[PDB]
Amino acid sequence: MPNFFIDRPIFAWVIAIIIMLAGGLAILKLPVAQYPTIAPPAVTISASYPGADAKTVQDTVTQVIEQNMNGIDNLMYMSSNSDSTGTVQITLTFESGTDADIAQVQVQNKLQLAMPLLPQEVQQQGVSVEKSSSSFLMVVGVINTDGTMTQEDISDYVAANMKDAISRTSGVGDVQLFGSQYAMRIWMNPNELNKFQLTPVDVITAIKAQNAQVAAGQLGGTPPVKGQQLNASIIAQTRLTSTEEFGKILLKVNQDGSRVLLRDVAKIELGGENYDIIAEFNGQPASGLGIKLATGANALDTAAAIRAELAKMEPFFPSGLKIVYPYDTTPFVKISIHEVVKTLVEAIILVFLVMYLFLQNFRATLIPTIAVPVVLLGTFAVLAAFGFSINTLTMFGMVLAIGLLVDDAIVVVENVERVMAEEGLPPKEATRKSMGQIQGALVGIAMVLSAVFVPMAFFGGSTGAIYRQFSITIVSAMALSVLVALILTPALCATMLKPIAKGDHGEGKKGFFGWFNRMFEKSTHHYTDSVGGILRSTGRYLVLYLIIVVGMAYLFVRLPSSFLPDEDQGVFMTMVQLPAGATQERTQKVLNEVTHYYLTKEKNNVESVFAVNGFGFAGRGQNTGIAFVSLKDWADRPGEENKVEAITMRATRAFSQIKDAMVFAFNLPAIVELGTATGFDFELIDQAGLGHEKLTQARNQLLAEAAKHPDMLTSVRPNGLEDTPQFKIDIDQEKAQALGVSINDINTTLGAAWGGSYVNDFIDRGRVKKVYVMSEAKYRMLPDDIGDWYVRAADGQMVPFSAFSSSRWEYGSPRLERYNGLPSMEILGQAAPGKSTGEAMELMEQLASKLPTGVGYDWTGMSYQERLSGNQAPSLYAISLIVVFLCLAALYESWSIPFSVMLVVPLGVIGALLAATFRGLTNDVYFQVGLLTTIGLSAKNAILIVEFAKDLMDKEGKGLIEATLDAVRMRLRPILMTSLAFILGVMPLVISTGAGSGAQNAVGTGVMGGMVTATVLAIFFVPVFFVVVRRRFS
Amino acid sequence: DIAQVQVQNKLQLAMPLLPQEVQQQGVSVEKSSSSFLMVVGVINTDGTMTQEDISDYVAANMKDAISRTSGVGDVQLFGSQYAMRIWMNPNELNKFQLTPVDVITAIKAQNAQVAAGQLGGTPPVKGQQLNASIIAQTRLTSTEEFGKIL
Amino acid sequence: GADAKTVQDTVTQVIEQNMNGIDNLMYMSSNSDSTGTVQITLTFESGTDADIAQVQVQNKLQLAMPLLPQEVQQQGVSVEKSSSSFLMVVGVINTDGTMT
Amino acid sequence: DTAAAIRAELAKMEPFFPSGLKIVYPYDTTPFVKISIHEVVKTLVEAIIL
Amino acid sequence: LPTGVGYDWTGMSYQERLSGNQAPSLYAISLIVVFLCLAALYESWSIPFS
Ligand SMILES: O[C@H](COc1ccc(Cl)c(Cl)c1)CN1CCC(Nc2nccc(C(F)(F)F)n2)CC1
């Protein structure tokens, strides 16, 4: 096949042009995102039941929905939580590879069938089903500096003016508003209501009656009278549109005729739908917009379009309003992608430089410069054909495969040049001979590398997807590299190279090139002499190989395991947790302290703090909060102390002094969608209907038992809230009946006053908005205020709550959790240093096995994936080894020679492990993929050496030792000039300390160490293996 | 999947027109075979439980989990889950001048769980230090509680 | 029994807000009538799977579904694949003349 | 696969059953499927031997 | 027309505009493909040009 294209250079050029055009089209059309879809598809059902506690929401909402979640396909599991804020959130996690749209529609349809079973208030608020597996591309904050506007005003302006245009922007998959529109608010005064002998029920009824839309017909509508000439539509009562109209709503008229309008007993004002969450941006009122990218959309282009649309908005904004970007990771993504592209380009340049240094022929150096970009473009085209996208994993896969591509080009070009220099043949016949020598080896190497890299794609779950990214990328790059080396590279060698003499090795050259040449023949002679001396004492080097293997096992077992390096993305989060029962003001004070610290002590690094009072992770209440701290540009933060890790450690140390609050600063997970992968997630399930208290006791016992094992488990804590005091009101039905007051009226008055009620809608500036009736804050603060509220009995006399009710304080859960439809409690933990997560989970299972009767357990989150993919690696790599052995036996036509090639893996693995250990890195995904790349390249070198030696023994009459020595002499130069090029290409990643330095270092350090040791050891261990194997079996 | 999606898309138009009792009993749309894949029976080898108890246990502790298993298209319970059964005596109702309407109204009023709001709820007053959930009438959980309805 | 402007603001805009995130969408049209009817048509690119497009439109619509007035829910919001032309018209007459 | 998943779920449930409760399988066509497939495979092996 | 009043095409007109817009690209790509195929088959850059 190489001979076909050697005689047809134009056909090979046409093939290369086609590949380049396809790659360019793919680059133009390929989506770009930081990461692909890694986490399993998940669908979240969210409902709100205003004024309701956790138990009320769970009993009336959560349990019904969970009982009606049946018949949905590919559901891995289902969890739910009901808060004291009145919010239920149910996450259904489906198996990987499930169509998210189909799962989402099935979940919606089962909820639509369950909807009639829910409270009317829950139905009125609406139950929303979303896909929660995705994260936010961007978060655009809107702030007011003049102080004229508040959070509600800014949120309403964003909803009315900004949301639509952002949604219409190209590539904007989803837009969610951090806040709510305006809503009419009826702040009831209990004393005024008692004075006029009214109750909140009357206000609700009047508002419903006097704010509605009525269908009214048409003048002349059909069936029509015989000569009708005019047809028109009749307009009747329409919804109110202003606070003034609501003010005049009439609730009663006095005997005298003075009118008891609505404003008499309440304050009418436009406010927020919910006041639970307060937002500030550097201590200024703010609202937000979270923007999620669409499918197949370019993240960079989408961010640019969003910014352009916001700039278009800017001139029309009300004076004093400003756009800010509290959370913008797109710059980090851009820098990472640009750094990878720069790495690839510099790799090509280093290949050119090394090729010129060794061969000292410009036309020879041109050939790899044409070959490698063609393979890269073909790889892009193949990725587009498979539906992949340009992301961090794919780009680093290309970076890793660059070494294989460089080796493929260098082998062909150097072999052709060596044949020309030795036999003196002209370029065409020299190329023919070289390809006749190396083509079978190249095909066998293609098969071997396919066997090595394909199995990654068959891991299960999130790790399966992460490894499949690299697997597809590298396998496609390798296949295109081999195809190019068989099609185009020989044609380029035959057409571009110029004749070289039968004996010229360059030693006649005058300056640095001549010195380097002569030094190189001297070094090659010394290397051949050393190898020959080695082959006479093979036993010592066999025991040395055993020592190397033992050291490899030691380093592997003693190396920690990780998932993905933590990156300095320019943003981190501080979570604030106040004691139970804390109010919004105390959390606001703590958040103000945190913001002041960040903007004063860390003023050089931090540019903005987005404080969110009322919402924090693993909670939703007044006693929780979260601040999203954004750092200045990496170029403005030079040093190791000005990075996210150091900043977070300093902030945590400073905040540990804060009293009456737990404040903890931390960096983002590498993949926020998967969240943390640090430890284990454990679910303790109530299986026998024990109750909340018994489950709490079981959880406490398990936590104590885990704490009694410091050396195996660390920071085993509950991922939930503890029980808190609650105000219980016991309404005596007998007393209420005796005094002539209905229980329904009492409950309605209490709920409307102290929790608020949603009555109906109105039209504000041509937008439908909600109407809420609630007590004024002054009269719904303390238990004593219960005495300020009166209910009208059937007799028309107002009776107090104390007359027909009593009060006390009890304990209740502010957040109730369920797993797979049963009550549960979530425990988060992690293995102690030096302990694997598997044995930590085994110990947790052993501890849980001793818990009281009726208490079960389950694994969720990352633990579920770990259980799924626990045993895949050994079997997959056993299959890989078997297939590699079979391919090598096919290549060499021998059942024993393949062992000489396969004995080379430890040579690179040991160096990779040593490099990782010395730099204090972990066994993460990047390290493993780099390990596979190093193993593949070392196997390539060994395969070529053994092929040359065997061909020398068979086609010629040379003996074992002579053939091996000649083979190593022939293969020394390509090995060295590939290792040097790849090592120098990866050095920038090794020494990188800027943005994205985590993944860069993880990819670079292991690769560099593995290449160094693979080269150095293999160049004189492979001949030993070949000689020993040939002697043993022959 | 698409067939079920379209069928229930059309069914959602009829749902508002169906009687409230039908909606409250739960309308189901399913895609499954006409024949049972299998039958998982449950007995008691000690003889302590009756048919009602076994059926309630299967409905409450095993039915939902099986229904959520992938590949399960339908689950038919050979029994029924427990429920609070009020067996009315017409003679007693007439003696006290009562009607099943009155019984239903009393059950609805005195067996309910109401959202009662919060102490120190947002918007709060300045200087508010306490925030708590107000608990009120809760659903009854025993036959004794139901028998005490006035 | 709703005006064209009122139904457009209360219904048409609300629905149209959440329909901009659907895949393979070429363009969108909508008409609001004084009879209270709202008709929105989303035209997708050629070769798009119609069933998947309809499923995605349902998924986006259910988000805005609660925001519509209770009367809209009572009558119901329908999402279905549509065509703008009649394949044929089948008329029925009474030759005798005994049926109006 | 569905039968295997159902049996796995029942195994999860079983440890928490009340005293005396027992699961039985009064109707299951799956064992016939397994035995039939096994018999055909056995026939193939015996055919190779013959 | 006054400022703020734009226009667009729909239905048949959208398809007609798209076809007219993408015709020249189609011609160029087809010519390039034929040229490359001729060069590949006849092993020359002169025969495809002629
Ligand atoms: O995951 C979502 C977004 O969380 C964030 C938020 C900010 C950043 Cl910068 C980032 Cl990165 C992430 C969670 N989210 C929390 C509250 C929000 N509801 C709200 N309501 C009123 C005001 C606000 C606030 F504070 F965001 F303006 N939010 C709705 C759901």
DSSP string of B61-125, one letter each residue:
IIIHHHHTSTT------SS----------HHHHHHTT--HHHHHHHHHHHS------EETPSSPP
- The CATH classification number of C1-82 equals 3.30.70.1430
A261 DSSP β-pair partners? A250
Q: Say yes or no: A217 contacts chain C, CB-CB below 8 A.
A: yes
Greatest Cα pair distance, chain C, in angstroms, is 56
Instruction: Note the resolution in Å, 1 decimal.
Output: 2.7
Question: Is A687's Cβ below 8 Å from some Cβ in D?
Answer: yes
Instruction: Give partners of C (≥3 CB pairs < 8 A).
Output: A, B, E
| Chain A touched by B135 (CB under 8 Å) | yes
Cα–Cα distance for residue pair B122/A583, rounded to 1 Å: 9
Interchain touch E–D (≥3 Cβ pairs closer than 8 Å)? no
Peptide bond connecting A285 to the previous residue in cis, omega within 30 degrees of 0: no
CATH architecture of A677-723+821-864: 2-Layer Sandwich (3.30)
For chain D, how far is it from start to end, CA to CA, in angstroms?
Answer: 34
- Determine if ligand 1 sits within 6 Å of the CB of residue A610: yes
Chains A and D touch (3+ CB pairs under 8 A): yes
Cα–Cα distance measured from residue A264 to residue A267, given in angstroms and rounded to the nearest whole number: 8
- The verdict on a CB contact (< 8 Å) between E45 and A8 is no
Three-state SS at A891: helix
Q: Alpha-carbon distance A577 to A660, whole Å?
A: 9
Cα A615 to averaged position of ligand 1 atoms, centre (Å): 8
List the 856-875 stretch of A: residues with Cβ below 8 A of D: 856
Kindly indicate whether the domain formed by A724-812 is annotated with CATH number 3.30.2090.10: yes
Strands B132-135 and A724-731: parallel
Dihedral angle over CA of A1019, A1021, A1022, A1026, nearest 10:
140
Does B43 sit within 8 Å of D24, measured CB to CB?
yes
What is the 3-state secondary structure of A943-1010? HHHHHHHHHHHHHCCCCHHHHHHHHHHHHHHHHHHHHHHHHHHHHHHHHCCCCCHHHHHHHHHHHHHH
Cβ partners under 8 Å of residue D11, min gap 6: none
Does a cis peptide bond (omega within 30 degrees of 0) precede residue A426?
no
CA-nearest residue for atom 17, ligand 1, is: A178
Give the contacts of A957 (CB within 8 A, at least 6 positions apart): none
> Which tokens go with A252?
């009663």
Q: Which CATH architecture has domain A133-179+276-328?
A: 2-Layer Sandwich (3.30)
Q: How far apart are CA A987 and CA A999, in angstroms?
A: 14
Q: What length is written for chain C?
A: 100
- Nearest of A45, A42, A53 to residue A115 by alpha carbon: A45
Instruction: Give the number of other CB atoms < 10 A from CB of residue A739.
Output: 16
Q: Give the residue from C37, C28, C83 showing the smallest Cα distance to C60.
A: C28
Instruction: Report the Cα A933 to chain-centroid distance in Å.
Output: 25
Q: Are A62 and A82 in contact (CB under 8 A)?
A: yes
The sign of the CA dihedral A392, A398, A401, A402 is negative
**CA distances to A173, A174, A296, A571, C73 from C18, in Å:** 10, 8, 19, 29, 18
Question: Ligand 1 test: best mutation among A615, A628, A672, most atoms within 8 Å of CB?
Answer: A615
Domain spans in chain A, listed from the N-terminal domain onward? 2-37+329-510, 38-132+813-820, 133-179+276-328, 180-275, 511-568+865-1033, 569-676, 677-723+821-864, 724-812
**Does residue A94 contact residue A75 with C-beta atoms inside 8 Å?**
yes
CA distance A171 to chain C (A): 8
Backbone angles phi, psi at A560, to 5 degrees: -70, 160
* CATH code of the domain occupying A2-37+329-510: 1.20.1640.10
| Cα Rg of chain D, angstroms | 17
How many Å apart are CA A638 and CA A825, to the nearest integer? Answer: 44
- CATH fourth-level superfamily of A569-676: Multidrug efflux transporter AcrB pore domain (3.30.70.1430)
Interchain contact B39–D (C-beta under 8 A) = yes
- The closest of B118, B117, B101, B108 to B140, measured between CA atoms, is B108
Q: For residue B118, give the nearest of B136, B131, B128 by alpha carbon.
A: B131
- CB-based contact A227:A243 (threshold 8 Å): no
**Residue A678 burial by CB count (10 A; 0-12/13-18/19+): exposed, middle or buried?**
middle
Among A128, A163, A178, A609, the mutation site with the greatest number of ligand 1 atoms within 8 A of its Cβ is A178
Name the one residue in this structure whose structure tokens are 């007995």. Answer: B43
The class (CATH top level) of B80-150 is: alpha beta
Which residues in A147-255 belong to E strands, given as ranges?
172-178, 182-188, 218-219, 232-233, 250-253
- Phi then psi dihedrals of residue A713, to 5 deg: -125, 140
Closest partner CB to D5 (pick from B54, B62, B69): B69
The finding on whether A291 has its CB within 6 A of some atom of ligand 1 is no
Question: A382 to each of A340, A371, A544, how far by Cα in Å?
Answer: 19, 17, 43
CA-proximal residue: ligand 1, atom 11 (nearest): A327
Report how far residue A235's alpha carbon sits from residue A655's, in angstroms, rounded to the nearest whole number: 62
Which residue has tokens 């049209």? C29
Question: Contact A23/A381 with Cβ under 8 angstroms?
Answer: yes
List, in sequence order, every residue forming a beta bridge with A252; answer none if it has no partner.
A260
Tokens of A754: 């102290």
Chain B residues whose CB is inside 8 A of the A747 CB are 112, 114, 116, 136-137
Closest residue of D to A852, CA-based? D16
Measured in angstroms, the CA of E13 and the nearest CA of chain A are apart by 22
CATH superfamily of A511-568+865-1033: Multidrug efflux transporter AcrB transmembrane domain (1.20.1640.10)
- What is the CATH class of A38-132+813-820? alpha beta
The dihedral sign for the CA sequence A91, A94, A96, A102:
negative
**Nearest CB to C76 within list B2, B5, B13:** B13
